[PDB]
């Protein structure tokens, strides 16, 4: 999980398969859908919570009433500073949390795959897996869907691993 993938444009997270029946990239439906829903909800919550009322910012004053004009300027400057500081901090925190959440999702998918197999795939260290036993399209679909059966291919994986 070092470099990005330009061959996957149907999902933020997904897998790449390659066997005797072909090769390609396939986005994981459930994880991508959950991430999309959560990000959309975050954006909608950020945008919607800004309550707006019919107001008229900016009041004209006479030359004599300079004190009230200075008070209005001070109020406007205070509101501007508060809004700028709060918006900057919110944007920074949200960006950091989103990046951390994406990294956590990738790590969780990797951990889920490793927990599902736990012996069947040699780890290269770059996020890839090398299946000891022969795997077809059905096996790849079962692994991606999460319904992989350990004892069905455990014997074959052990036999292939004990060869070396």
């Amino acid at each position, epitope marked *: 999980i070092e470099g990005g993938w330009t061959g996957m444009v149907d999902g933020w997270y997904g897998y790449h398969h390659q066997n005797e029946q072909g090769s*390609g990239y396939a986005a994981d439906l459930k994880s991508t859908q959950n991430a999309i829903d959560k990000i959309t909800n975050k954006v909608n919550s950020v945008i919607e919570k800004m309550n707006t009322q019919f107001t008229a910012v900016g009041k004209e004053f006479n030359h004599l009433e300079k004190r009230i004009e200075n008070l209005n300027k001070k109020v406007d400057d205070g509101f501007l500073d508060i809004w700028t500081y709060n918006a900057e901090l919110l944007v920074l925190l949200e960006n950091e949390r989103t990046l951390d959440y994406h990294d956590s999702n990738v790590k969780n998918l990797y951990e889920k795959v490793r927990n599902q197999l736990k012996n069947n795939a040699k780890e290269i260290g770059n996020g890839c897996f090398e299946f000891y036993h022969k795997c077809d399209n059905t096996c790849m679909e079962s692994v991606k869907n999460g319904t992989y059966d350990y004892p069905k291919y455990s014997e074959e994986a052990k036999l292939n691993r004990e060869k070396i």
Partner: antibody
């Protein structure tokens, strides 16, 4: 306006093999999934098979599993459908179509459906 | 799961007609539906998108709705050119397949 060209039709004896080719232009072929849908002469439509935009995900129905193969090339923007063990029921008009894409934060989410159809290739057995 | 449609529909010119589409409650409610129009010997064209919208070039007279497990397609301002076949398409995740109806004939 997208353009789709379909070829490979003709007459094939029962139990033989056949190949269908679909070429696309006017849109990025690597960012949209594809579908092959057949229609019997005088009957309704019948979805046959499909492949994801980035490949790696081939969807087949129960009546075509183990019989039809889908292979797409994004560099040539071509799609090949190979049919084996042909039967008299296979005589129909096949259509190559693109899928719908939802734009979510610059990401194209595949939606099950057909936006623009091809022209139709008649296969008789 | 299977999809059922009326064998045919009838309507005088200038009136409105309704086409009904039904299916299994497990998949129809969760997923979306599509209505397609096919002419005589011509390539079918999409009519109903995302259960509420339509692609470009589709006249506004067509309308679509989805209540419960039943989808309804309404056609107003019926014309001679509007006489064509209509199909209902859904997606099923239990079988992971695109299901199409038997087709409806409008006259």
């Amino acid at each position: 306006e997208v353009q789709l060209v379909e070829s490979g039709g003709g007459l094939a004896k029962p139990g033989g093999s056949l190949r269908l080719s679909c070429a696309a232009s006017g849109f990025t072929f690597s960012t949209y999934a594809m579908h092959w849908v057949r229609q019997a002469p005088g009957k309704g439509l019948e979805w046959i098979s499909g492949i994801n935009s980035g490949g790696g995900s081939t969807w087949y129905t129960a009546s075509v599993k183990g019989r039809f193969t889908i292979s797409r090339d994004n560099s040539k923007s071509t799609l090949s459908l190979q049919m084996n063990s042909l039967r008299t029921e296979d005589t129909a008009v096949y259509y190559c179509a693109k899928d719908g894409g939802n734009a979510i934060f610059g990401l194209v989410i595949t939606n099950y459906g057909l936006d623009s159809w091809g022209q139709g290739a008649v296969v008789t057995v | 799961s299977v999809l059922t449609q009326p064998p045919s529909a009838s309507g005088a010119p200038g009136q409105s007609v309704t086409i009904s589409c039904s299916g299994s409650s497990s998949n129809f409610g969760s997923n979306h539906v599509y209505w397609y129009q096919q002419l005589s010997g011509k390539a079918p064209k999409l009519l109903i998108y995302n259960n509420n919208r339509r692609p470009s070039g589709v006249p506004d007279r067509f309308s679509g709705s989805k209540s419960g497990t039943s989808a309804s397609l309404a056609i107003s301002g019926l014309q001679s050119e509007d006489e064509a076949d209509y199909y209902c398409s859904v997606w099923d995740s239990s079988l992971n397949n695109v299901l199409f109806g038997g087709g409806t004939r409008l006259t």
